[PDB]
Design an enzyme around this catalytic site. Structure first.
Site, PDB file in Angstrom:
ATOM      1  N   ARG A   1       0.684  -1.352  -0.134  1.00 52.38           N
ATOM      2  CA  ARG A   1       0.130   0.189  -0.025  1.00 52.38           C
ATOM      3  C   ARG A   1       0.909   1.230   0.296  1.00 52.38           C
ATOM      4  NH1 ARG A   1      -2.483   3.915   2.805  1.00 52.38           N
ATOM      5  NH2 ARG A   1      -4.777   4.277   2.655  1.00 52.38           N
TER       6      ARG A   1
ATOM      7  N   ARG B   1      -7.080  -2.561  -4.561  1.00 51.99           N
ATOM      8  CA  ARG B   1      -6.578  -2.426  -3.106  1.00 51.99           C
ATOM      9  C   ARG B   1      -5.811  -3.536  -2.573  1.00 51.99           C
ATOM     10  NH1 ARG B   1      -8.329   2.090  -0.882  1.00 51.99           N
ATOM     11  NH2 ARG B   1      -6.012   2.025  -0.413  1.00 51.99           N
TER      12      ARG B   1
ATOM     13  N   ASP C   1      -6.026  -2.826   2.907  1.00 53.45           N
ATOM     14  CA  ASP C   1      -6.499  -1.761   3.651  1.00 53.45           C
ATOM     15  C   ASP C   1      -6.686  -2.326   5.360  1.00 53.45           C
ATOM     16  OD1 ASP C   1      -6.170   0.425   1.910  1.00 53.45           O
ATOM     17  OD2 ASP C   1      -8.189   0.194   1.360  1.00 53.45           O
TER      18      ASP C   1
ATOM     19  N   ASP D   1      -8.500  -1.078   8.713  1.00 56.57           N
ATOM     20  CA  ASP D   1      -9.078   0.102   9.278  1.00 56.57           C
ATOM     21  C   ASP D   1      -9.248  -0.248  10.559  1.00 56.57           C
ATOM     22  OD1 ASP D   1     -10.139   1.980   7.089  1.00 56.57           O
ATOM     23  OD2 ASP D   1     -10.279  -0.329   6.374  1.00 56.57           O
TER      24      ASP D   1
HETATM   25  C1  LIG Z   1     -13.747   1.060  -1.405  1.00 51.85           C
HETATM   26  C2  LIG Z   1     -14.697   0.885   0.094  1.00 51.85           C
HETATM   27  C3  LIG Z   1     -15.541   2.011   0.279  1.00 51.85           C
HETATM   28  N1  LIG Z   1     -15.550  -0.184  -0.523  1.00 51.85           N
HETATM   29  C4  LIG Z   1     -15.414  -1.647  -0.090  1.00 51.85           C
HETATM   30  N2  LIG Z   1     -16.324  -2.587  -0.658  1.00 51.85           N
HETATM   31  C5  LIG Z   1     -16.072  -3.623  -0.070  1.00 51.85           C
HETATM   32  N3  LIG Z   1     -16.963  -4.683  -0.582  1.00 51.85           N
HETATM   33  N4  LIG Z   1     -15.124  -4.075   0.781  1.00 51.85           N
HETATM   34  C6  LIG Z   1     -14.159  -3.189   1.302  1.00 51.85           C
HETATM   35  O1  LIG Z   1     -13.454  -3.378   2.003  1.00 51.85           O
HETATM   36  C7  LIG Z   1     -14.345  -1.734   0.893  1.00 51.85           C
HETATM   37  N5  LIG Z   1     -13.506  -0.888   1.333  1.00 51.85           N
HETATM   38  C8  LIG Z   1     -13.885   0.436   1.062  1.00 51.85           C
HETATM   39  C9  LIG Z   1     -12.865   1.335   1.710  1.00 51.85           C
HETATM   40  O2  LIG Z   1     -12.622   2.360   1.128  1.00 51.85           O
HETATM   41  N6  LIG Z   1     -12.281   1.032   2.753  1.00 51.85           N
HETATM   42  C10 LIG Z   1     -11.207   1.647   3.554  1.00 51.85           C
HETATM   43  C11 LIG Z   1     -11.695   3.012   3.991  1.00 51.85           C
HETATM   44  O3  LIG Z   1     -12.489   3.044   4.945  1.00 51.85           O
HETATM   45  N7  LIG Z   1     -10.808   4.259   3.822  1.00 51.85           N
HETATM   46  C12 LIG Z   1      -9.671   4.015   2.775  1.00 51.85           C
HETATM   47  C13 LIG Z   1      -8.537   3.473   3.420  1.00 51.85           C
HETATM   48  O4  LIG Z   1      -7.444   3.883   2.803  1.00 51.85           O
HETATM   49  N8  LIG Z   1      -8.480   3.062   4.632  1.00 51.85           N
HETATM   50  C14 LIG Z   1      -7.062   2.413   5.439  1.00 51.85           C
HETATM   51  C15 LIG Z   1      -6.254   3.769   5.924  1.00 51.85           C
HETATM   52  O5  LIG Z   1      -7.132   4.310   6.822  1.00 51.85           O
HETATM   53  C16 LIG Z   1      -6.381   4.850   7.878  1.00 51.85           C
HETATM   54  N9  LIG Z   1      -7.196   4.466   8.994  1.00 51.85           N
HETATM   55  C17 LIG Z   1      -7.491   3.312   9.609  1.00 51.85           C
HETATM   56  N10 LIG Z   1      -8.182   3.538  10.874  1.00 51.85           N
HETATM   57  C18 LIG Z   1      -8.362   4.737  10.482  1.00 51.85           C
HETATM   58  C19 LIG Z   1      -9.398   5.521  11.500  1.00 51.85           C
HETATM   59  N11 LIG Z   1      -9.982   4.746  12.626  1.00 51.85           N
HETATM   60  N12 LIG Z   1      -9.710   6.784  11.551  1.00 51.85           N
HETATM   61  C20 LIG Z   1      -8.990   7.434  10.450  1.00 51.85           C
HETATM   62  N13 LIG Z   1      -8.019   6.803   9.546  1.00 51.85           N
HETATM   63  C21 LIG Z   1      -7.960   5.505   9.526  1.00 51.85           C
HETATM   64  C22 LIG Z   1      -4.865   4.223   7.819  1.00 51.85           C
HETATM   65  O6  LIG Z   1      -3.935   5.199   7.366  1.00 51.85           O
HETATM   66  C23 LIG Z   1      -5.135   3.334   6.637  1.00 51.85           C
HETATM   67  O7  LIG Z   1      -4.214   3.268   5.818  1.00 51.85           O
HETATM   68  C24 LIG Z   1     -11.115   5.474   4.416  1.00 51.85           C
HETATM   69  P1  LIG Z   1     -12.212   6.704   3.284  1.00 51.85           P
HETATM   70  O8  LIG Z   1     -11.498   6.844   2.008  1.00 51.85           O
HETATM   71  O9  LIG Z   1     -13.374   5.814   3.277  1.00 51.85           O
HETATM   72  O10 LIG Z   1     -12.373   7.948   4.135  1.00 51.85           O
END
Ligand SMILES: CC1(C)Nc2nc(N)[nH]c(=O)c2N=C1C(=O)NCC(=O)N(CC(=O)NC[C@H]1O[C@@H](n2cnc3c(N)ncnc32)[C@H](O)[C@@H]1O)CP(=O)(O)O
Ligand SMILES: [Cl-]
Length: 151
Positions: free
Chosen positions: A82, A85, A88, A90
């Site tokens: 990364r 994807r 990731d 979370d």
């Molecule tokens: C594409 C989508 C919408 N569709 C999906 N469809 C299905 N079927 N299945 C999926 O799995 C799926 N996944 C989806 C998705 O995007 N998932 C990830 C996500 O939620 N994002 C983007 C990201 O890269 N995330 C990891 C980073 O987050 C940082 N990080 C970790 N924890 C936290 C926290 N608690 N608070 C703030 N940052 C945090 C850290 O740095 C990590 O590197 C945030 P956003 O772009 O939504 O804002």
């Protein structure tokens, strides 16, 4: 403190990434994997011209501060590619804490809208209650998120 971490990858053969991620999560210092969900094949929520995801959840006991946990999960993501994807990680929940910093929003800002996060979480934490008092079981019922298929 028990942290709940969501895992997602939609590489063609995501098992390598997810298996690797689980091993690496277990190597995080002052931390222990308690339980891991089954692996699920989920259609992408968002754009539809992408491959299916492998999704899972893991309960991790940790003495680390939430930000130090984030450092470690980000490290794992980086080391697996990364920068579809690859991986990731979370942080969905961190004990009963509500966090709103520049690095962390906990509970994860969108998890209550995502069946692919809530169903694996329900598998490993069926009696879970959110910081706002809402039960995970109740949220799943209200939103009627369709149950998932194992990978
Ligand atoms: C594409 C989508 C919408 N569709 C999906 N469809 C299905 N079927 N299945 C999926 O799995 C799926 N996944 C989806 C998705 O995007 N998932 C990830 C996500 O939620 N994002 C983007 C990201 O890269 N995330 C990891 C980073 O987050 C940082 N990080 C970790 N924890 C936290 C926290 N608690 N608070 C703030 N940052 C945090 C850290 O740095 C990590 O590197 C945030 P956003 O772009 O939504 O804002
Ligand atoms: Cl490394």
């Amino acid at each position: 403190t028990v942290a709940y971490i969501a895992i997602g990858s939609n590489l063609a053969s995501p098992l390598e990434q997810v298996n690797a991620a689980l091993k690496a999560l277990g190597d995080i210092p002052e931390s222990h994997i308690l339980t891991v969900s089954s692996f699920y094949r989920t259609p992408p929520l968002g754009p539809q011209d992408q491959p299916d995801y492998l999704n899972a959840a893991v309960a991790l006991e940790t003495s680390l501060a939430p930000e130090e946990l984030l450092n470690h999960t980000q490290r794992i993501e980086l080391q697996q590619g990364r920068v579809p994807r690859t991986l990731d990680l979370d942080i969905m929940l961190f004990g009963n804490e509500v966090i709103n910093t520049e690095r962390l929003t906990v509970p994860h800002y969108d998890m209550k809208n995502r069946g692919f996060m809530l169903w694996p979480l329900f598998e490993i934490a069926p009696e879970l209650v959110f910081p706002d008092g809402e039960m995970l079981r109740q949220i799943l019922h209200t939103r009627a998120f369709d149950k998932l298929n194992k990978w």
